[PDB]
């Protein structure tokens, strides 16, 4: 039970309820090598929410890429998950999503954004724990991860998501 409680506590430590999320990925070099070697291709972020009782969402990253980005890019995806209040929300999910890899010199962030395709199963009301992820397979060329660059610092990177709250 203590393992389950620890998990709940970690989830709550990371949760936000205003559609803004910052994901600190520590132990970067080990996790990237794990991705390169295929042992752990992808990592899921903690869940966050659009409002106190809003959509439940998380992020999914491939540190050595997925699909068209595989082996050359960071791939970064957005996930709609089954939330506790889905019966109260409008479906399909229709909010603009902005995704960023933060420059830790705050000069040139990587940023991409999309409007949900409301005909995609990624944005319908979830029947499973999560919907199929969707996002940017070509989010960031892996070369931007080099040591001379300022996205990786002290073996960590920072990913930021901004879910637009218009109409909510």
């Amino acid at each position: 039970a203590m393992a389950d409680l620890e998990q709940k506590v970690l989830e709550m430590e990371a949760s936000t309820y205003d559609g803004v999320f910052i994901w600190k990925i520590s132990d970067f070099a080990r996790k990237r090598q794990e991705a390169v070697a295929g042992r752990i291709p992808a990592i899921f972020s903690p869940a966050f929410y659009t409002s106190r009782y809003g959509y439940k969402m998380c992020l999914r990253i491939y540190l050595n890429g997925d699909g068209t980005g595989r082996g050359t890019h960071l791939s970064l995806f957005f996930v709609v998950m089954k939330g506790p209040n889905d019966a109260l929300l409008r479906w399909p999910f229709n909010q603009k999503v902005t995704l960023m890899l933060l420059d830790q010199n705050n000069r040139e962030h990587v940023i991409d954004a999309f409007r949900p395709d409301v005909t995609s199963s990624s944005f319908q009301r979830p029947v499973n724990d999560m919907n199929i992820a969707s996002g940017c397979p070509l989010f960031c060329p892996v070369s931007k991860m080099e040591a001379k660059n300022s996205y990786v610092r002290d073996d960590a990177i920072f990913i930021k998501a901004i879910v637009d709250l218009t109409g909510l």
Binding site: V97, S122, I132, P137
Partner: peptide, 5 residues
């Protein structure tokens, strides 16, 4: 957006 493979 493109779905994860």
């Amino acid at each position: 957006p493109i779905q994860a493979s």
